[PDB]
Amino acid sequence: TIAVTGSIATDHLMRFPGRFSEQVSLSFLVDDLVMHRGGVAGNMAFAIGVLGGEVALVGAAGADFADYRDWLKARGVNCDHVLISETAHTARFTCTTDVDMAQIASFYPGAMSEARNIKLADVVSAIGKPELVIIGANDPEAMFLHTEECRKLGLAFAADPSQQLARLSGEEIRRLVNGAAYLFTNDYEWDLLLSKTGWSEADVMAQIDLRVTTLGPKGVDLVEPDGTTIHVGVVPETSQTDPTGVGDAFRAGFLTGRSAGLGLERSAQLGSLVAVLVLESTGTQEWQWDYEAAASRLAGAYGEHAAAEIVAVLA
Amino acid sequence: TIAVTGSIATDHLMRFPGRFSEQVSLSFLVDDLVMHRGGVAGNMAFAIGVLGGEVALVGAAGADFADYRDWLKARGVNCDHVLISETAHTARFTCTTDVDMAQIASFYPGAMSEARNIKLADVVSAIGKPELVIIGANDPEAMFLHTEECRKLGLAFAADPSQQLARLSGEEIRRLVNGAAYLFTNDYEWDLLLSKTGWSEADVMAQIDLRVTTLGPKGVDLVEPDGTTIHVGVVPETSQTDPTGVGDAFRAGFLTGRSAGLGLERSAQLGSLVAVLVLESTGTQEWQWDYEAAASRLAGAYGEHAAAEIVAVLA
Ligand SMILES: OC[C@H]1O[C@@H](n2cnc3c(N4CCN(c5ccccc5)CC4)ncnc32)[C@H](O)[C@@H]1O
Ligand SMILES: OC[C@H]1O[C@@H](n2cnc3c(N4CCN(c5ccccc5)CC4)ncnc32)[C@H](O)[C@@H]1O
Ligand code: NA
Ligand code: NA
Known part of the structure; x- marks a missing residue:
């Protein structure tokens, strides 16, 4: 829950x-x-x-x-x-x-x-x-x-200060991050967080259980405190319609995967699918969930094995 | 009408x-x-x-x-x-x-x-x-x-193209201007109209009966084809709230003055009052008409003689 x-x-x-x-x-x-x-x-x-x-x-x-x-x-x-x-x-x-x-x-x-x-x-x-x-x-x-x-x-909490990071002070950001199970940002926001907090990369990783950094068309990085890093590329889009809410969608799919017992890579594959479905629509909640289309696009991007593992927890 | x-x-x-x-x-x-x-x-x-x-x-x-x-x-x-x-x-x-x-x-x-x-x-x-x-x-x-x-x-018509001047071609603008009883623009728009039409100042004045050029905080110019020029300063504001619709208000006050028989200067004085009332409110139609306050602010800007002449045609 x-x-x-x-x-x-x-x-x-x-x-x-x-x-x-x-x-x-x-x-x-x-x-x-x-x-x-x-x-x-x-x-x-x-x-x-x-x-x-x-x-x-x-x-x-x-x-x-x-x-x-x-x-x-x-x-x-x-x-x-x-x-x-x-x-x-x-x-x-x-x-x-x-x-x-x-x-x-x-x-x-x-x-x-x-x-x-x-x-x-x-x-x-x-x-x-x-x-x-x-x-x-x-x-x-x-x-x-x-x-x-x-x-x-x-x-357990996920620190997810996207849009407010520019408005928050370094001290305010530091107070949001310590002890987080997950830190979510995009790449620009990650550099900004480091600059404003005065923390190094290692300083942050010692205070959280996982860093998730989205990279736009370059996909997403999942970084553990010991340095273990998983890079997941995007599900390639058939249109760029409207970018609003794409990050929210990634996070929701990833965390739903995690809640269903999937590993880090599989969860980020699911998040990437939800993200592209939002990129391909105008509203943030206007996308539709089509199980067969989901399985197909996951397989085309990540292979049939990964696709089957993911949709197994969504049926 | x-x-x-x-x-x-x-x-x-x-x-x-x-x-x-x-x-x-x-x-x-x-x-x-x-x-x-x-x-x-x-x-x-x-x-x-x-x-x-x-x-x-x-x-x-x-x-x-x-x-x-x-x-x-x-x-x-x-x-x-x-x-x-x-x-x-x-x-x-x-x-x-x-x-x-x-x-x-x-x-x-x-x-x-x-x-x-x-x-x-x-x-x-x-x-x-x-x-x-x-x-x-x-x-x-x-x-x-x-x-x-x-x-x-x-x-009789007034050419009032304002917001569309950037999107219209020189030829389209020329077709809107010839034969106008009034041409309304702001100063930036007047320079733009001359550039896009390729007309000189004199070329324009030979095709219209009156040029009205608003100057923002510097007031308004009314220019006849023979060069006779009336400059009317603003009614000084007590706040700058929102500039939306100020130009529309000037034109409406000016043209109402003209419809009521006032001369050019008096009509532009009335227009300047309506303009400042819009500058001092947020919506474009949110201002209120207070006869006594109108007479007072007209007199403070332009003198009691002008104020009395203007409000005589109003209620
Ligand atoms: O993820 C997409 C969803 O984000 C939703 N949203 C868009 N701005 C949002 C926001 N702000 C923006 C303005 N502000 C700021 C701060 C620092 C510098 C500049 C501006 C404060 C933070 N805060 C919360 N939700 C927002 C939107 O409703 C959409 O559905
Ligand atoms: O005078 C204030 C009133 O102007 C109303 N309005 C605001 N834009 C308006 C507009 N456009 C803007 C967009 N477009 C354009 C053209 C050239 C360059 C860039 C864009 C076409 C012309 N056209 C008619 N009314 C407009 C508003 O409703 C307000 O009450
Ligand atoms: Na969208
Ligand atoms: Na206004």
Whole structure:
């Protein structure tokens, strides 16, 4: 049972047929506008639920959340512990993506700031101790309070400060990482974390059980504290549609694999499949789970043996 | 009776507390998100109606327009000739403004593209010949067709291409300008128009009856074909809140002044007041009309004589 903390949002996603390069008073004429379910925690919970995992969504939203709640419950997500603001609306992410997948976005937190009033102890009282708590991008104070509570209650946690790493200080980042079962970042964020914390590579690896570093088109690295390193290439895409939520999808597939007993490489192969399915769609939760297509693309990228091992835990 | 053609939209307006200067994968954490009535033609019709003028809004919107319609009708705007799409949603403008009033925006046209199917002859059949047709930013094909129809039917028109000037070719711009009773642009746009058309200053002035060139904080120039030039400074602001729609407001106030019989300078003084009221609010139609406050600020900027002459034609 995975508890996913982080943002819950509505994503307003637009497509610019040009290149931001070519273009202060910027104006982009866009040819697509769609409104979809979002937030890092909603995205990850959705994917874990669709894949058959046991998952609870823990974050703050507005009263407008009813339909999103029904959507997620239909996919097996426990939404009992979503804090509903008395006054604020669910966060909104507004993003324009150009033909090269570059992005210009604005994020309005809304009810997300109230996540600092959530107590993981209440979740535990309701459903028991989760096997893993994901600490995703969120209200910063909530990110700290949740990490501290995980340590105090003895809950394994994944440090997943993607989008907030630029806003956090070195000390704040250090406080999010120590003792993590997993640290997730992309490659740029990893260099940034090292610069801001003042930690060396070895300093970090001595405080976590596993580093997971995504590399965009180059795939993903899984690095253990003893240096053992697994590199998994991407599942090659047939389209680049919209990059929003691809990292969330990787994490959800990887952690669902781990929850089902798969090893590190197989779990990262599953995560790579979910990631490409999101890259090939516009919303973050608009992809469909087709068991046969999953088995096929996993086999084409990684071999029939790996594919069979993975889908065996998804049927 | 003024017919206002151009865009009809919903504006989603956000505030970035920083400076865009300081920041491809841009992400702005914003501290305000509001949804307001917009579109250049809606903005200008709203202001003309609030000021007591006779005005008809002529553009394309979606079925979602009902509430907007009621809003405008309550302020005297004839919305009978708004084309309602069978399938498309009203256009959306999404904009983030930083602390120095710089802007990053995306525009989704939606139903705006259907404005090319509007015939001004049908408007004329319903309400008679308008005294002036404003040709505001719109579906480009509609801008051309409307201008051509004004010439054919003998309707005075104002060339007001603003936001579309970068996307139109020199030839397309030339076709919008010849024979205009008024040409409206800002100063940057005037330089751009001269460059793209290949016309000199004198070439343009021989084809229009009046040039109106807004200068931002430096006010506005009104230039007749014989060179006679009136410069009107701004009504000084007490805040810079959001620059969206300020130009639309200037044009509406100016043209309402002209429709009420005021001279060029007095009309531009009125336009400058409406402009500052929009600069001091967030939406484009969120300002309120306070007769006494209007008279006071006009007198402080331009003297009691001018103020009294202007408010004499208002309520
Ligand atoms: O993973 C994709 C999902 O991320 C969701 N999202 C997009 N921005 C998000 C965010 N912010 C961005 C703005 N900000 C910042 C900080 C430092 C420098 C610059 C900006 C604070 C952190 N925080 C949480 N979720 C976010 C979206 O809803 C989508 O579904
Ligand atoms: O005056 C303020 C009002 O302008 C409304 N608006 C904002 N963009 C608008 C627009 N576009 C922008 C995008 N595009 C372009 C063209 C050249 C270079 C780059 C992009 C086509 C022209 N066209 C009509 N109305 C617009 C808004 O709804 C607000 O209420
Ligand atoms: Na996507
Ligand atoms: Na404004």
